[PDB]
């Protein structure tokens, strides 16, 4: 790839075999810096790792309410205890043929669109005194998050084979801007305070929030079809004894899904502007002197 | 910088489109530059005007992206004849060192006026200084385009005459000088000298004799 | 309010420092932006550069290693020093007050704005000519009249443009009509002024034209009478 800049995504050009096997065309396209690496000349980040398959531009990534049902002759047991921590005996049990409407939201660091809690917010764990055990916190009242990619992009169909049409990115109509998110500074202040309340019921001390120790370092989710990577440092930066909080999100088009056997996926670009509104109903923390 | 010609009629509405359309959010400046004169800031922000600019000078704002920048002059006068520049500042293109191209507005359908020829004989001090000069002065004619003919008695001259290209005036009419340099003996040896200024489709004559 | 007035040599030899100056009136020098603009015949307006209220330099890259826009705040004065001049540098040089606007379109914190500059008040303009030809003073010759009559003055063979013609040091200003000059093939300009006067004042309302040609340090006057 022969990649330019813009001002961030590169402007790359490359020779490609077309529908006819012996004729060459020189196409141009845009690729985010996270999708390319210098070899100036460039290439796609995966090529020394794995084959990549373009996601079909007609299948949706929409989290749909999925119900899990037990077979005939089996049973699922519920727990209506409104203060139930992860384990132990639940004194309010009910049997169900299927689970409730569960959305398979792929998220990181911040649980999105999930089920809230009743009464107060609860925190869970296995052995909370073991630091190498993740803490699953469930909120009772969601804090509104609003993310967007304001750049007005365009989709280009590149015929690189009989029927094989790779959808690329080309030209930003209008202003070049920054993909980001927004949550209420007050609502995240009162909710972080509620999370601080029960970090005392399990501990004594002072409660410090800091950034993580780009899939896992940042809040990574899916907004309208494109996978954001939102820097959550303006989120966890507090010590407890109008204003919007905005995160600077990057955008990837190639993701390594879950494993690393050797299969990656190319998310085709979404045309126009992107903006999605979600509910953060959970939080996945990790505790590490006197604090 | 090259010139873009534009023609409107007296009293109508002018529509000067910018020659460099914006790529992002824009902040366009419009300058009224009359040739060899101080430029006039018409519109600095996309549509904001300074103090002392008529309401008839309107600019297009960029509320929704896509609307190109145009200068709208309603009720055009004769004094609105000038150059017009589009200083384009947008978020994509860098720094706008260069002004716009040029849109020379020429108003059509103006009152046609005839010239006021005035010829002076050579001065006394310069005739003493061994040099003569006939000065045929032309003023207040429209459209500004005249051709000058000099006659020594009845014979054409064509030799030793300079002529000014018609420049504009404050009252929006035109003026042009015409100097015929003669030797002091040539000016005295001839009975009469004439100046024919044929403006549009008619000539006017102004003659002077050495007496 | 604020007005400006430039002042320059008017004639500079090739490969030399085209010095210049611009004094502003009724305004502080150190709280606005100031732009220099020239405009040659045949070409359009050209933005030389601009200095800030912070005295920061920023020139048109069109002019490579040449421009240097100074400023001295003891008075209301700021200069302009072009050097290594050539024939294409002949133009009218204007002095204008630039003002800064900040056009925000996205988020101010992310840097989604850009700075644009607009000039709101201009100077009158200083004509500058470049040529190896030396300066030249003129030589006026009166023009005597013939209900209404006309008389004037003939300003012959000067260099370079321009000259200023007043009548009775500034008193007679109605009917005055100074004409554009003529570049003779000899390389010298020639101008002609003329005033339409009531024929009753022909005898005798004294009439004198005041000719000033700055590149020659000359100030001459001449009477007109039949
Ligand atoms: C997620 O979180 C994010 C972070 O919290 C959050 O980000 C926010 O995003 C939004 C949208 O993306 C941003 O909104 C933009 O804001 C821009 C800035 O607006 C401010 O500044 C201007 C100008 O201020 C100067 O002028 C005023 C008077 O004119 C003075 O009083 C000021 O003091 C100031 O002058 C000094 O400062 C200058 C430096 O800037 C100096 O140069 C100067 O010399 C002086 O020293 C103000 O006018 C604005 O006031 C408005 O808001 C107040 C509330 O504060 C209200 O009372 C009222 O509604 C006011 O109108 C504000 O303070 C805007 O420029 C921008 O809007 C323009 O741009 C868009 C796109 O570019 C256009 O579509 C739009 O139409 C606007 O264009 C108009 O204006 C331009 C420039 O003036 C014109 O060229 C153009 O022709 C057009 O004019 C038309 O409309 C005008 C009215 O707007 C009208 O006057 C004209 O006559 C004509 O009709 C846009 O709104 C916001 O900034 C972000 N926040 C931050 C902190 O960055 C995000 O929203 C969150 N949510 C998400 C992402 O979902
Ligand atoms: C990413 O990089 C791409 C290059 O690899 C960019 O594409 C190029 O973009 C430039 C403008 O930035 C185009 O240049 C324009 O071309 C048009 C077309 O006119 C041509 O054809 C006529 C025949 O009618 C001919 O007479 C002209 O001389 C031109 O040759 C012109 O109208 C413009 O004035 C200007 O020259 C390139 O054509 C274009 N190349 C390709 C292969 O697309 C792309 O813009 C970059 N995008 C970003 C977001 O950075
Ligand atoms: C959380 O749920 C909301 C609502 O279902 C999602 O917003 C939808 O997003 C899709 C695609 O961007 C749109 O077609 C819908 O119209 C949106 N619905 C509403 C009500 O706005 C949101 O994307 C979800 N968030 C996550 C991270 O999955
Ligand atoms: C395509 O191949 C030609 C072969 O001559 C080469 O010159 C050109 O640089 C190639 N294009 C790119 C984008 O590398
Ligand atoms: C592939 O290349 C990248 C260069 O960014 C390198 O970090 C990575 O270790 C390489 N992987 C393999 C399997 O070679
Ligand atoms: C987010 O919370 C609001 C407030 O209850 C609700 O209206 C909306 O449906 C919720 N969205 C999702 C996806 O659960
Ligand atoms: C949940 O509650 C039971 C008793 O009700 C307790 O034994 C268990 O430790 C609790 N779980 C956590 C993670 O504290
Ligand atoms: C929890 O972990 C600590 C060490 O981190 C260990 O000493 C303790 O026995 C563990 N408790 C349980 C119930 O696993
Ligand atoms: C995005 O660009 C397209 C043209 O490519 C245009 O039709 C559309 O209105 C633009 N949308 C916005 C929100 O600017
Ligand atoms: C998020 O967006 C919704 C709808 O646009 C709005 O009601 C809410 O106030 C926004 N919240 C934040 C924190 O931006
Ligand atoms: C997140 O933002 C902070 C400042 O807001 C910055 O110092 C940090 O480097 C950012 N994180 C990453 C991974 O770049
Ligand atoms: C906060 O964000 C919402 C939507 O994201 C927006 O409507 C609101 O104006 C923003 N407020 C501030 C102060 O930026």
Author numbering:
A (entry chain G): 129 to 135, 153 to 184, 189 to 309, 312 to 321, 321A, 322 to 354, 357 to 365, 369 to 396, ...
B (entry chain L): 6 to 67, 67A, 67B, 67C, 68 to 95, 95A, 95B, 95C, ...
C (entry chain H): 1 to 82, 82A, 82B, 82C, 83 to 100, 100A, 100B, 100C, ...
Can you quote the paper on this entry?
Viral entry is mediated by the HIV-1 envelope (Env) glycoprotein trimer, a type 1 fusion machine comprised of three gp120 subunits and three noncovalently linked gp41 subunits, which binds to cell-surface receptors and fuses viral and host cell membranes. Entry inhibitors targeting the gp120 subunit have been developed, with a promising small-molecule lead, fostemsavir, the prodrug version of BMS-626529 (temsavir) currently in phase III clinical trials. We engineer crystallization chaperones to identify a crystal lattice suitable for determining high-resolution structures of inhibitors, spanning a range of >6000-fold neutralization potency, in complex with envelope trimers of clade A and B HIV-1 strains.
We sought to examine whether the new lattice could provide experimental feedback on the recognition of Env trimers from different HIV-1 clades. Env trimer had unit cell dimensions similar to those of the BG505 SOSIP.
